[PDB]
């Protein structure tokens, strides 16, 4: 009996289409982020701050066009959680290989699983656990195999603080799920006020550059201000502030800016759509399908790096290990959704 797949898809087709859209948005968001931060390697904080400002005004415009007394305290909690998440990620990605990052995403799956069991009282089926261990074991084995071979430096403490970065983004995802599916706040108002408090908590991210085990992004107490002014000079105008001795094994990354506002704008648009469709998935379906649709981007980034049109001049060949990561993801997610389907059928049957 293999005709049942059509009915199963035609019942709930929006989640698969939304996963396709989130895929096409997340791969392009990361692609354009690394393409602009290869164009402006310095001035990262400025890029994120301007991105949050335009996120805020764009979401307020969209809320005006389309959309306990108030939830500003909850929005501030969400934004501070996201801020410490990006702190711990920015710290952990200094000594972390490209494979352990995908394994870290696959480890953000069960963190979210357990913390959604604990706080907001989920009930998991047999097949759900089987799918999660399937995906995580497969991708862990293959990426740890690839990381034994890579020359990319690695320290276990930095991978651990990357997991510690996964923790508060889970707190924020499930508390926005709470404020969506309990109080019925709008998506757009939430994202606008979250971006407001993200401006503030990124300007409080600013003191993390002071510590010196950063390779090229370390900035002392004296030249944080000039870095900001030079970042505005590069982005908003196109002035290049470092063209002398610069690059690999040196102090700062080399910057080109005469046409970087365009790439930054595309990155910001794709990240805006990423956060928007993320909040839509979290409000509409769950904060647990979102982590699956967010872990699609690990294997898919490797799939997309095969092309020169997407990844500029630094591509790779289709090794079978990327394909088995992809197909392990697919089998795990399929059996996970099947477990969710049995759970929903047993719930609606009673």
């Amino acid at each position, epitope marked *: 009996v293999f005709k049942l797949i059509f009915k199963e898809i035609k019942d709930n087709i929006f989640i698969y289409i939304l996963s396709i859209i989130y895929l096409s948005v997340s791969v392009m968001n*990361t692609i354009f*982020a*690394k393409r602009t*931060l*290869n164009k402006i*390697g310095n001035y*990262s904080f400025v890029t*994120s701050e301007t991105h949050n400002f335009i996120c805020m005004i764009m979401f307020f415009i969209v809320y005006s066009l389309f959309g306990h007394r108030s939830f500003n305290l909850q929005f501030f909690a969400i934004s501070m959680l996201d801020a410490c998440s*990006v702190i711990l*990620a*920015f710290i952990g*990605l*200094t*000594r*972390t290989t*490209g494979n352990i*990052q995908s394994f870290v995403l696959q480890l953000s799956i069960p963190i979210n699983m357990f913390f959604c069991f604990l706080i907001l009282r989920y009930r998991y089926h047999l097949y759900n656990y089987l799918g999660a261990v399937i995906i995580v074991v497969t991708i862990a084995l293959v990426e740890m195999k690839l990381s034994f*071979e*890579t*020359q*990319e*430096e*690695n*320290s*276990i403490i930095f991978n651990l603080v990357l997991i510690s970065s996964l923790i508060p983004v889970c707190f924020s995802n499930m508390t926005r799920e709470i404020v969506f599916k309990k109080y019925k706040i709008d998506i757009l108002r939430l994202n606008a006020m979250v971006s407001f408090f993200q401006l503030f908590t990124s300007c409080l991210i600013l003191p993390v550059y002071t510590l010196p*085990f*950063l*390779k*090229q*992004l370390h900035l002392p107490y004296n030249e944080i201000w000039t870095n900001i002014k030079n970042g505005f000079a590069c982005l908003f105008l196109g002035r290049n502030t470092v063209v*002398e*001795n*610069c*690059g*690999l*094994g*040196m102090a700062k*990354l080399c910057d080109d800016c005469d046409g970087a506002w365009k790439t930054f704008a595309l990155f910001s648009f794709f990240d805006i759509c990423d956060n928007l469709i993320t909040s839509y998935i979290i409000d509409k379906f769950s904060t647990m399908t979102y982590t699956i649709v967010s872990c699609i981007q690990g294997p898919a980034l490797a799939i997309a790096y095969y092309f020169k049109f997407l990844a500029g*001049d*630094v*591509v*790779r*060949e289709p*090794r079978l290990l990327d394909f088995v990561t992809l197909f392990g993801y697919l089998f795990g997610s399929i059996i996970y959704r099947v477990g969710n389907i049995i759970l929903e059928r047993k719930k609606m049957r009673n």
Partner: antibody
Amino acid sequence: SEVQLVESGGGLVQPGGSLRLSCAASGFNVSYSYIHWVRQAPGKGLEWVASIYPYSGYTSYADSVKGRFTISADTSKNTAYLQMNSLRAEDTAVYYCARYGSNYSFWYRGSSVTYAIDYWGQGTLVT
Amino acid sequence: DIQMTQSPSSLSASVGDRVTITCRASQSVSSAVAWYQQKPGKAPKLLIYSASSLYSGVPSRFSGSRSGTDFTLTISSLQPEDFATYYCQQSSTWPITFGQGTKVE
């Protein structure tokens, strides 16, 4: 201020013995970068010997020297040592200590580090 | 594991020529290879990192390119200080293998 990597311990050693080389690094911090020894025999190409990441303490060796050599680092004094044991007659060569200069590309959810051997020492001859 | 078979071991080229030194890796290395130039009796200077980018201090004559695994260094116009031995080096997998050299004369 300016980067240097000055070696020591080179010279004549009998076949089947021990020798310790010691590259002292100036300017940059040894902990935040790879350090690796690379040899070349008279009139031949460059051959990798070993490598160390002193912060993780992670050591790697070539296939012809594994189990015989031992690379290490004392990051308190900011140098790096290579002991060669059970030395043969085909290991005579000029040995350079050298680091990886690293370029840190970073998107807000991931980071790729590219490497290239930035600064080389002047080299010590071993026989 | 990976070895880098270098194009022509030694090429003869006068001043003002355009020389192209090629090295193909065995399996799919990414853009992360580098190129050095060692004169007789000195340490190898770094010329190119990541197969496309000039190191700080390198003149504008040297350039790197790739198509798959066949990396290619090229010089726009040789000068009498560009006569040396040129190696390429991968940085993907841990058995580090240089090229066997390429002497310009």
